[PDB]
Every structure is written in C-alpha cells, then in structure tokens.
Amino acid sequence: MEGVYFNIDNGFIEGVVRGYRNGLLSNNQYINLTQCDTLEDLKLQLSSTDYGNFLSSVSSESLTTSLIQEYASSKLYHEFNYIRDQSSGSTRKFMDYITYGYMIDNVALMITGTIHDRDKGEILQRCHPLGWFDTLPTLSVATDLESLYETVLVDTPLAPYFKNCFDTAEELDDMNIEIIRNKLYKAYLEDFYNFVTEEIPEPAKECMQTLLGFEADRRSINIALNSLQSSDIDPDLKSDLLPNIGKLYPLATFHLAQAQDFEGVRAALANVYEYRGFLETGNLEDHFYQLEMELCRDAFTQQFAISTVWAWMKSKEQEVRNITWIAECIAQNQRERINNYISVY
Amino acid sequence: LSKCKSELIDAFGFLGGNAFMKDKKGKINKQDTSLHQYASLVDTEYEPFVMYIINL
Amino acid sequence: FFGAIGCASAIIFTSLGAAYGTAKSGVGICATCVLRPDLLFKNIVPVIMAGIIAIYGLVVSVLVCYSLGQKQALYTGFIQLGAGLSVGLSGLAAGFAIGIVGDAGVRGSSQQPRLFVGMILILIFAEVLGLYGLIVALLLNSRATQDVVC
Amino acid sequence: FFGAIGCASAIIFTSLGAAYGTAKSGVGICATCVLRPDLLFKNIVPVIMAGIIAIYGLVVSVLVCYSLGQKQALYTGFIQLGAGLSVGLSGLAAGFAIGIVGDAGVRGSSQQPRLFVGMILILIFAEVLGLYGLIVALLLNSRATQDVVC
Amino acid sequence: FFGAIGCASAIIFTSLGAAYGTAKSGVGICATCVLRPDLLFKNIVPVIMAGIIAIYGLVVSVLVCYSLGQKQALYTGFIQLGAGLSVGLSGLAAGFAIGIVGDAGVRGSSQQPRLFVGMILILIFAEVLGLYGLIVALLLNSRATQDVVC
Amino acid sequence: FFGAIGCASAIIFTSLGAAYGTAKSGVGICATCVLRPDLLFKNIVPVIMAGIIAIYGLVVSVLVCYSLGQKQALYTGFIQLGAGLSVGLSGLAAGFAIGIVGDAGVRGSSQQPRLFVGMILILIFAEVLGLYGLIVALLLNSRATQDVVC
C-alpha cells in the first residue's frame, strides 16, 4: 500500500521539495497577483515565494522580459539540477526521465531552428534536465543526426532521446516540422506510463494515475486541434495510440488523435468532463491548465513517495509560464488575459 | 573494389608525400560510424594521390 | 537453551526498530538543513524517541540471563524465548512507527516550527506499543522462576 | 510451551497493526497540519483509534501469562496459542483499516472540515474486528488452562 | 488444540477481509466528498458491507470454542480447524471484492447521484460468497458431532 | 480428517473466483454508467453470472458433511479431499475468466445493445467447467464414503 518506505535518496529529495513548500506559489498567490496594476504592489506580494527570493536580491522595478529569464535560470539549477547529482537508484532515474521528457521536444526545436538559423547557444526558460552551459548548447549547434548520438552518450543516465533518435534517422516522419513533434509527444506519454508501471508496488497512486491518463487524453486532443485545418498525415506517426482498456482502446485513441473529429471516441473520452474536444483553441487551453493542475495539489499530501516528486515537477512548468504572463503585463500597465479567466492555475 | 582501392594506395601514395599518407583503410556503408571513407574535402582523412571512386 | 536465544531475539528486533527509526528521520534532518539551518533543536528530537525503546529492552535481556535454569528444559526454554520475543518485536513495531511519523514530521518542522509540537505528540503515541510488550515480557521472565523453577 | 509464544503473538501483531496505522495517517497528518494550523485537534482523534486496540491485546496477554502452570504438554500449549493469535491478527488487520482511511481523511477534513465527524464514523467500523477477536480470546483463555492435558 | 486455531483462523482472515473493504472504500468516500458532502448517506452503504462479515464469523467462532473439549483426537481437530478456515477465507475474498467495487461505485455516485441504487446492487452480489461459507462451516460442525465436537 | 478439508477447499476456492469476478465486473459497470444511465438491466447479468457456481458447491459439501464418520483411513481421506478440490478450482477459474470478459464487455453493451447476448455467450463457456466440477465431485464422494471404520 504505502508505509513500507526505506529509500535513502527519495527522503533527501522530498525534504528539499517540502522546504520549498513553505515558500511555494499557490492558486491564492496568483489570485492576488492579477489584481495589481502598480509595479510596487506586485513586487511585494511575490517576494516571499521561491521565485520571490530572486527579486528580493536584485530589486528591479522595470519587470522586463529579460529579468524573468535570469530568474528561471537561477531557480531551475537550484531546484532541479544540483539535487539529481546527490540522488541515486531508481529515484534518480525516474526524476531524470520526467525532466528529460520536456527535453525531447525542446532539443528538436533548437536543432531544426539551427538549419534556419535561430540561436547557437542561447536557450530560453522551460523545465529542463541540464543548464545552458552543460549539454543543451552542444545539442543545439548541430544540424546533422550523427552528432546528436555522440553528445547523448556523454551524460549518464542515457537519455530517452537516444531511442527516439534512431527512429528519426530512418525518416519515418519526414523533415516536415509538425510530424516530427507529434511522434516525440506520443513517445513521451508512452515511456512515462512504463516507468510508472515499474515504480507502482511501493507508493499509492489514485490521483496520479488518473491524471497521467487525463494528460494523455488532453495531448491527443491537442495534436488533433493543431493538425486540423491542414490535414493529418496518418501513414507517418502523427497520431497517438495509447494503452487504454477502459472506455477507450488503442483503436479509439488513434481516431481521436487524428484530424477527423470523430464523435463516437469523444463520447468515450468525456461525458461529465468540461474538455470534450472542441474546434475552439482558447476554451480548451483554459480548461487544460485547471484540470492538469488539480490532482497535483492533492498529491502533495502524500510524502516520501514516488507520486509526490512527479506532481511537483509537473506543477513547476505550469508555474513558470504563469509567472511569465503576470510579470510582463504590469511592467507595461495592462491587465492579464488567461490568468484572470481561471481561478486554478 | 576493396582490393583495388588498397593496391593503388600502396603503390602510388608515396608520390603524394609521407605527411599525406594516413591509414583508415576499410569501408563502412552502414550508418554506425562515418570514419573510413576517403575524400580530400574532410580533415578526417585525405586521398594520397589524385583518385576519385565513382559508384553508379 | 532457547532461553539464551530468548536474550538474542530481544536485542536484535529492538535494534532493528530503532535503527530503522533513526535512519529515516536522520535523512529528513539532513534535507531540512539546506534551506533553513537553525531548526536543529527541534529536528534532533525524533531520533531520541527511538533510542529509549532499547533501554527498556535491555532490562528484559539481563533478567533472562539470570533466570536460566540449571540445564533447563524444553518447557523452560520456550517461556524465556516468548519473553525475548515480546519486548523485541513490540520494540521493532513502535520503532518503525517512529521513523515514518518522524521523517514526515521534520519536514513538518521545516515549514512550521510552531506546530512541530503537534507532531511530538504523535510520536509519543507510538511508544506505548513498546511499553505494553515490556510489561508482558517482565511477567514471562518471572513465571520461568516461579513454580520452584520451571 | 506454545502458550508463551501466544502471549508474544498478541502484543506483537497488534503492535505491528498500530505501527502501520499510526505511520500511514502520520504522513498525511503532517502534510495537512502545516497549511491549516487549527486542525491539530482533529488530527489527534484518528491516531488514538489504533492505540486503543493494543490495550485490549495487553489484557489477553496477561490472562495467558497467568494461565501457564508447569511442564505443560503440546496439546495444552496449542489451546493457549490459538487465543493469542485471535487478538494479534485481528489487531493487525484492524490497525490497517485505521491508517488507510486516516491518511485519506486528512485530505477530506481539509476540503470539508464540516465532515470531520463523518470520517470518524467510517473509522469506527474497523474497530468492530478488535471487539470480535478480543471476546473470543477470553472465552478460549479460560478453558485453555489445563496445566498438562485435562 | 486445532479447535483453538480454528477460531484463530476464522478470526485472522475475516479480519483482514473487512479491513480491506473499509480501507479501500473509505479512500474513495473521502475523494468524492471534496465535491459533494450530501452523498454522505449514499457513500456509507458500500463501506459497511465488509464489517458485517466478521459478525457472522463471531457466531461460528463462539460455537467452535464451546465445542472444544479438554481432550481431543486428530479427527476432532480437523473438523473444527476446517470449519474456522472456510468462514475466514470466504471472508477474505468477499471483503476484498467489496472494497474494490465500493471505491469505484462511490466515484459512480459523485458524477451520477441517481443510479446510487444500482451500485448497492453490485455490492450485494459479492456478500453472497461470505454467507455460503458461513453456512457450510456452521453445518459442518453441527452435523459432525464427535461428542458435540469435543 | 482429509475429508472435512475437502468440504472447506470446495467452498473457499470457488468463493474466491466469484469475488474476483464481481470485483472486476463492478469497476467497469460503474465507469460505463456515466456514458449511459440505462444499462442497469444489462449490467446485472455479467456481475452475477459467476456466483451461481457456489450454490452448487454448498450442496456437494452438505452431502459430504452427512457422510462423515468418526474415523477415516488414509486411502478414503484422499478421495474426499480430491473431490472438494474439483468443485473449488473450476469455480476459482471460471470466476476469474467471467470478471475479465464481463468488465470489458460493458463497453460493448453500451455502444451496441444488439451484441449484449454475444457477451453473455463468451462467459457461458466458462460455466460448463463449474457444472462438471460439481458433477465429478458428487460421483467421487459417493464411492469414497462408507462411513465410520474403514
């Protein structure tokens, strides 16, 4: 069930994550942060949080875009990067995978961007496994498939990118930018489930398990909405096939994920859930954030568990994007859009 | 082809100069590595006398 | 005989309980320190709970030594063995509780050091699992000697 | 003989029961308490349900202890053993029911503090198992005294 | 001798079984109640299915106890033993089944609170197993009558 | 003797099988019930299907109970014991199969009314194994028994 814990590494991680809870950002924290219009009030409310620690250090009243980026560097290295080193066992492996999972999509965007000329070393904010001076620039400068192998071998544990990289070598998706990204997202859901499957005899997942399944579902719907108005290229991998065994099946998830907008799969997907799969971009985005963020907050009550660490990473990316949206608007005297509409962030 | 490439290299390579002479003999057609494939363009290795291999 | 084994069984289980306790807790202390290094005075206290389990354990063991019959019997052994067990695994069972409640409690201490005291109270509730076994154990040791020595 | 290990069984398995229970809830308790600091008072009452199985367990031990005579047979041993088993393992399983709900019940209190008392009634139902074993153990214990096969 | 252990067998498995049902179901109750706390009355009906199993066991157990004679042969033994077993392990499986359904049916309640009558129906079907085992065990004892199974 | 254990094993394994079945079948039925709330009548026929093995079992056990004596030999014992196993295990396997097919098959019911009869048909293939197991047990039991003094 639970309470059979004896992991050296996961205690250490959890203690650090709990110390952060004291200063964590919350739905309350955001609700107060939107009301502002003056530079000073906003500043003051934020200062006690984990992100707030950085602003206290360097007191800045312009709250420009660049300021936000520096803040992300400092926090991501401190919260994620340093701690992994000091971990071991399956706690290190599991934590590295979820972080790497974001990585898979970003690396591809830096590499294709490079062919087009984007940036040769500069990477921006997002949950990542390594910093902007460890592995990610070495990855970015290269335009050929081969080099991507050689870099990946250096950092142990072996990235999920290695496997993904073999498939993409043979052109099973082409060089068209969207078909690649959709395949990497199918892969990202698939590997996470498997890593969960191993880890499950020791913790207790209800909320986590139900949320991971809903995350998948939302992703499938995202890939459909996008490839709509431009057709879905079904021969190549651009649509999600996912283990379900409930209402949906492998056959069902594939219909849903393509551009087809087929209702019978939809009836299986939701009946009482606010998201149903609409041809409206905005509405789904509001719902996605709220739904995704709940189950993670409830999950924090679990402690010294594999369940808690997953929820925390997943919350931090959603947190990053929120903060970015609020600090930019107040710098230039205007209100927020998305932050104002939802009450759960 | 493998035998041909070697005999010419041994025989004529000396005229181009000792500095010019590198051993990375052999040929990999599979994508497992990109060494072992001559061309003056790359700094990895060089042809040691004017030789082009033409594959139709 | 088994009476001697009685001693053994007691000294091991209760070590294991308390070890396990101190292990988990300790990792919580280690962890708390890196964001807030001055909660030590509160933090340390969980460890000391599991340590007091052994001292009650020790009295039983020594008692059993003395209470060995002449060459004993099959029946004599088994009373002594049963006493050894009682304090031992009741000892382990409190010790295990103390490590898990404790560890969560020091992360408890991290965020609020004011309602840390509420956690201390949980810790104490688990020590009674030891005490109750200790009581029995004493009574088992005494029964061996009674009946003009069993 | 086997009766002494029966005494052991009782106080040990009921304690493992209470350990896991106190443990599971404890983890949830610390989490909820450091966010809402007025629910400490509620928290105490889940914990104590698992402490109170042990005190029935303690009594059965005491009976059985007394009921050991001198140079018993395997047959007399076995009767006494069966009683100790009954309260040990019902205590063990009951203990479990108290922790699994308890933890979850800290999440319930938090979101709905009106329904603190609703959770309590749910917990009372696992206590019926402690009552059920305990009784039966008494019945057995009384008879069980033969002191070399009646 | 094995009669004591018969009672014990019954008291261990059924206890485990109830505990499961209470545990599992409860966890689901707590979750559904954060959305709706007027489904308190409906949610309670799944949880309580497991606890009543043990009361049936309680009839049989006390029976077997009173039927435990002061001297027993191997044959008297297996009948009392076999009898406690049957109610214990039917108890285990019934209790387990009810816990799984009980959590799931409570989720069923939350989204649809008018098919509440239909979830209750699902549950009763897994109680039937507990009953058929209780029956068999009781009858086995009563018919068999060695010397009223002494 | 080994014959009494026969009575047990028959009703225990089979109770397990069905419970397993009900539990699985339930988890599916409650989920499908938010897609269409009219599937009550269809729902009831998979869940309950596996539980009709046990009532057979109960009958067979009662035959055996009455045919018990005061002393069975090794050779007689082994046949009674082996007959119990027959009903218990077929029960155990049928139930397992029926809850898997049963849960998945609700999705099938829901979407396509017309193939409800087709789901029922998959399950029924397992039921045959429960009927013959009872058969087989009866016949065995009849030969073996000759009552007391073997």
Add this chain to the structure above:
Amino acid sequence: FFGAIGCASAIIFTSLGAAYGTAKSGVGICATCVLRPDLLFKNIVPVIMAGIIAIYGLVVSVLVCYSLGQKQALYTGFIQLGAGLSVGLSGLAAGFAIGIVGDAGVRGSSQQPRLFVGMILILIFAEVLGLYGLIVALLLNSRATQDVVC
C-alpha cells in the same frame, strides 16, 4: 486414492486452460465489437476453438469417477494418477496457447474481415497436444482399472 488425485489434476488444470483461453480471446473480441459488430458470428469461432478441448478433459474426469471403487491399491492408483496428468496439463497448455494467438487475431479480423479462416488454422494446430493427451489418458484409465492391481 491415488486415482482421485489424478481425476483432480485433470479437472483442475484443463479448467484453468480453457478459462485462460476464454479470458485472452474474450478481451480481444470485446474491444473489436464496438467498431465491427457484424464480425461477431466470426469472432465467436476463435473463442470457442479453445472450448472444445475443455469438454474432453471434463469427460475424462467423469470416466475416472465411475472407474473408482471403495479403495484400490497402489498400482491401480498410479496409472490412473498418471493418466489424469496427460489431459490436465496438455489441456492447460493448449488452452493458454489458443488464447494468446486468438487475442492478437481478433485485431487482425477487425482490419481484415476476409481472412478470419487463416486465424482458425493457427489455433487448430495447438489442439494436437490436448487431444492426443485425452486419447492416451482415456485408454490408460480403461486398462488400469480392476480395483486393487492392474
């Protein structure tokens, strides 16, 4: 005696085989039916292909029942024992095999209605172990029996 244990092997293991067959085949069909409900009549033939062995095992066991007396000797026992084994594990082994091939093939069916008959061919070839076993056992049983010495 030793024969009844034979009858036991046969009727347990082949029931288990068929159960697996139906389970694996079943879950596959249930998935397919909510997109293709015309292919039911075809679908029906893979599942029931593992059922036709199962009916054979059941009969074998029923044979052994009739062939058994009050008691038999060791020699008569051993061949009957060894005979039940043949159908029990060959039935089991085939039953499993037909289910795994089956499940994957209902998904092929879904994609390619026309080639249903080709899935059936793979299935039939696993039937030889089972069938061959039924024959061998049947023959052994018939010959063995005379009660006491073959």
Add this chain to the structure above:
Amino acid sequence: FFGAIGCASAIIFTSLGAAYGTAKSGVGICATCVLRPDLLFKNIVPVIMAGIIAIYGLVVSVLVCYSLGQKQALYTGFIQLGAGLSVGLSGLAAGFAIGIVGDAGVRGSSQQPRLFVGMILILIFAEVLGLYGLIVALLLNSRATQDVVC
C-alpha cells in the same frame, strides 16, 4: 511411483513447449496477416513444427506405464523417472527456442517473401534437441520395462 513421475515429466513439459512455440509464433503471424495476406501458407509452416514434439512424448509415457509393476525397486523405478525427464525437458527447450525464432522470422516473411526458407533453416536447428531426447528416452524405457523387478 517413480513411474508416475516418468509419465508426468514427459507429458507436462513437452506440452508447454509446444504451447510456447505456437503462442509466440501466433503473435507475429497475426500482426503480419494484415500486411500480406497471401503469405498465409508460409506462415503456417513454423507453427506446426513445435506441435510434433508432444506426440513423441506421449508414446514414451504409454510404454513407461506398462513398465511399472508393484514390486518396487528404486533403481528400475529411477530409469523410468529419468526416462520421462529426458523427452520432457528437451521438448520444453525446443519449444522455447522455436517460438522466439518463429516470431522474429515472420517479420522476414513480410519484407523479404522470397528468402523465407532462410527462417526455416534456422528454426529446424532446434529439432535436433528433440531427436536427442527421443532416442535416449526410448532406450532407457526399453531397459526399464520389467515391471520393476526388485
């Protein structure tokens, strides 16, 4: 006796070997059948290869029966036990290898139809292992047939 085990090893193991081989082969064949549907005949050739192992095993077993007396000799007995083993465990091993090679080779069938025979050349290499078993077992049977003269 040791005869019964001879029978047991040969018919259990080799049956599972064949099951393994077919299952595994099946999963590949069913994936592949949608892709290329007329390559059915070729696909079919691997599946039946593991099926012929069983029919050898069962013939060895019918003999072994006859070779069991009731005189009981350990050393004549042991050759029958030892004989069964040999075709059993060799049969299992051919089956385990054949399903792996069989599976991987249907991918071959799909892509390179023409060179399908290269898969066969591989597959057939694990049939040597059955011949090796067959031969050795037969001799051993033949020696054994004496109805265990003590």
Add this chain to the structure above:
Amino acid sequence: FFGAIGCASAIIFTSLGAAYGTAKSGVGICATCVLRPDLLFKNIVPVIMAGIIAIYGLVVSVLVCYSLGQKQALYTGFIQLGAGLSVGLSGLAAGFAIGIVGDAGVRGSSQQPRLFVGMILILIFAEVLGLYGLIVALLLNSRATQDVVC
C-alpha cells in the same frame, strides 16, 4: 539412483543450453537479414555453433544406457552421475555463451566481412568447454560400470 539422473541431466541441461543459443542469436539474425539478404550463409554459422554441443552429448548419454537396465547401487550410480553432469554443464554454459556473443556479432558479420573470422574466434572459445565436459565424461563412463556395490 543417481546414475539414471545422470542420464537425464545430460539431456536436460545441454538441450536447454542449445535452445538459449539458437533463440538469442535467431532474433538478431532474422532482424538483420531484411537489410541485406546476402548474409544468410554467414549468419547461419553462429547458429550451428550451439547445434554441435548436443550431438556430443548424445554420445556420452547413449553409453550410459547400455550400462543401465540392471539394479545397481551406490558405486555405479555416483560415477554415472558425474559423467552426466559433465556433458550437461558444458552444454548449458557454452550454449549460453554462444547466444550472447552471437547476437552482438551479427552486427560484426554485417559491417565487417573481413573481421568475420574474428567473430568466429570468440564463439570458438566457447566450444573448448564442450570438449572438456565430454572427454572427462567418456573416461568416466568406461570406469563407472562395476554394477552394484554400496
């Protein structure tokens, strides 16, 4: 006694060994052949390395057969045992080596046609063992037979 089990071990172990080899290598090869169908011949030569272990094994086994039939005792039995084991362990272990080396060496065979001889050489180091088992065994067989003698 042990001597029969010697026969048996030889056949059990070396079959399985060779299987393991053939499976592991097989999958790699079957996969590879789709790139270039020209490595057919090359690829087969690794697979045939595990085929030769077993044929040696048959030569030692067959000898033991002739020396068996009769009721022996300790002296023949243990020397026959030791011979069985020898062909057994080399077959198992060399068989094991070959499949590992073989798989990774399928990449070696593919890219390197001139370091193909190197690939053979690794495999060829494992074949040394097959010889060691066999030579020692052959010596053993001739000496073993003395018949009877404790």
Add this chain to the structure above:
Amino acid sequence: FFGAIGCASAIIFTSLGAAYGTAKSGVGICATCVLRPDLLFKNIVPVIMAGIIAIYGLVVSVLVCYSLGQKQALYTGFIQLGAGLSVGLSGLAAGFAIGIVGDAGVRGSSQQPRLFVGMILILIFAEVLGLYGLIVALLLNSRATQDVVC
C-alpha cells in the same frame, strides 16, 4: 564448538554492517569532494562512525574463543552460540542506520556545511543500539563458563 559458531556470527554480521555503512556513505563522500574539496575534513567523520561497530565484535570473539578450549558441555554450547548472535545482528542493524544518515548528510553538507555537526550527532545515537547489546553478551558468556549452570 557451538561457541565457535558464536565467535564467528558476531564478527561476520557486524563486519557486513560496517561494510554496508561505509559502502553508502562512501558513494556520497566521493561526489561531495569534487564539488567542494574543502569538505574532506567534515565528510570523513560520518564514514568511520560506522566502523566502530566492528571493533566491538572483535572483542567478544577474542574472549570466548579462549574460553572454549576443545571441550565444554552441550548446554554451555548453546548459551555462547546465542550470545554471539545477539551482538552480530544488533551490529548489522545499527550499521544500516549509520550508513543511511551518513550518506544523506554529506549530500546535506555539499549544499550548506554550516550544520555539519548536526549530521554527526544523529549517528552517535544509533551507536547506543550496539552498545547495550555488547554488554548483555559479556554477562552471558562468563556465567555460562562453568560447565552447566548459567
């Protein structure tokens, strides 16, 4: 002689404990030094705290070894043997706790070495669990040494 097993157990289990403590604590130290090499001094103090268990183990052994001579009573054997186990497994368990906290605290150091003295203090509390055991054994050993009458 059973005292020879007692000397060996104390020094074997504890050396393993000491082994485990140093293993863990080591992987942490080695990393921590490359990050900040200025924490060498601090980092070393935890690892050797877990090698103090080992030093006690040796002493018990030395004392007893000498008192064995070549002959003692059977009864004497059994107290000394049991003495040895006490220290041994108490060691083992104490060694686990010192390795876990030890490991985590050098990782604590790495981020913030201010409270380096607080990691150390926890480890010292776990050294009491070895101590109290180390005492009990010494009492047993001397008394038992008398040739019947402990």
Add this chain to the structure above:
Amino acid sequence: FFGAIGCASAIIFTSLGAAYGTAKSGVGICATCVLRPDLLFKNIVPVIMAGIIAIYGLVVSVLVCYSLGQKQALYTGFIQLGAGLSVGLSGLAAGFAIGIVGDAGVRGSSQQPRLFVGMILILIFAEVLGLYGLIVALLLNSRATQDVVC
C-alpha cells in the same frame, strides 16, 4: 559420495566462469570491431584470458576422477570434496571479474592504443583467484592419492 560431489563441483563452477568471461567481453569486442577494423590484435587478448582459467580447473577434475570410487574411505571422499569446491568457486568469480572489466575495457582499447596496456594490468590482478583455488586443490589431491594422483 563425498568424492562424487568433489568431482562435480570442480568441473561445473570453473566452466561457468570461463563461459561467462568469454560471453561478457564479446559484447564489447563485437561493438568496437565495427567502428574501427584495425583493433583486432588487442581485442583478442582480454577475451582469451577466461579460457585459461578453465584449463587449471580441468586439471583438478582429472586428478579427482582417478581418485573416484565410493569403496574408498571417507578420508579420500572429504579430500576430493575440499579440492572440488576450492578451484570451482574461485574460478567462477575469476570469470566474473575478467568479463566485467573486460566489457568496459573495449572503450580503453579504441581511443588510446598506448593505454591498452592498463586494461591488461587490471586483468592480471583478477587472475590471482584462479591460482589461489588451483594451488589448494592440487595439494589436496597430492594428499588424497600420493604422487600428484598417478
């Protein structure tokens, strides 16, 4: 007897080690061979090492084989026993070490020709175990049968 288990032990374990050593190093060697075709001459040396372990083993086995006979006294028996075990289990570990360092070392061959010689140096340190088993077993054999067993 104890002689037979001396013979079996030596020939089993040292062969495993060698097979393992060869297999493991192979995995590395195949991979490096494709990347450069020029490192053949180094690749051969790590792999072949674990093959020279098997030959020292081979010697012990033969020695013991000549000494083998169960009408020998127990003293020969136990000396065969001690010889078998020594070289076998060291042999096995020696094989492990040679294959682990062996795998890893292929990276060291490829980049730095110069520091190939360091890979060999590690490997020479793992050979001491082989020596250490072989040495005791040889002497042992010299005692069993005087004159190095001729």
Add this chain to the structure above:
Amino acid sequence: FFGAIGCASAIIFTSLGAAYGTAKSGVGICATCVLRPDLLFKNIVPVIMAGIIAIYGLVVSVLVCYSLGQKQALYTGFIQLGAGLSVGLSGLAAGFAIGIVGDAGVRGSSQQPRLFVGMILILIFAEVLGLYGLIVALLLNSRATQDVVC
C-alpha cells in the same frame, strides 16, 4: 568432516570478495583512462587494494586442509569450522565495501588530483574488517589442528 566445509568456506568467500572489488573498481578506471590519459598510476591503486585479502586467506586454508581426518571429533571439528567461517565472510565484506567505494573513488581522482589520498583512506577503513576475521580464525586454528584425524 564438518572441518572439510571449514576449508571450503575459507577459500571460497575470500575469493568472491576479491573478484567483486576488482570488477567494480575496474569499470570506473576504464572510463577514466579516456577521460584523463595521465592518472594511470592513481587508478591502479584502488583496484589492487582488494585481492590481498586472499593471501591471509591462503594461509588458513593450507593449514586446515592438511590436518583433515577420515572422521573427526564433533567438538574439535566445529572449532575448525568456525575459524573458516570468520576468514571467508570478512574477506567478502571487505571486498564488497572496496568495490562500491572503489567505483566512486575514480571520480575523485579524475577531478581532483590533490584529494587522491582521501579516496584511498575510505577504502583502507574497510580493510580492517578483513584483517580482524583472519586474527580470530588464527587463534582457533592453532588449537584445532593437530595433524590428520583431529
């Protein structure tokens, strides 16, 4: 006798220890040699640290080997047995430590030339363990041996 196993344990386990060490330590070094092509003399020292343990081992092994009898006394024998136990499992424990730490300690070299001495020191703390078992064994061993037939 029971001495023979004393011989076996000693040489076996101390060999296992050395291997584990050489292995684990090896992997770190092979990476470091291409990460840094100048720390060769530094890398070499950790690995060879475990293997020296064997040499103290060899001493005890040779002594007890030569002094074996046909039938040795029970009392005398175990004293021989226990010297063996001590040395084996001390070498093993030490060796286990040195390899986990060992692997870790190559990182230390790699990044920090100056803190080379601190990596070694952690290794040398576990080395005491090996020594101490050898001591305790020696003592015993003096007495135990007395030439052939102790």
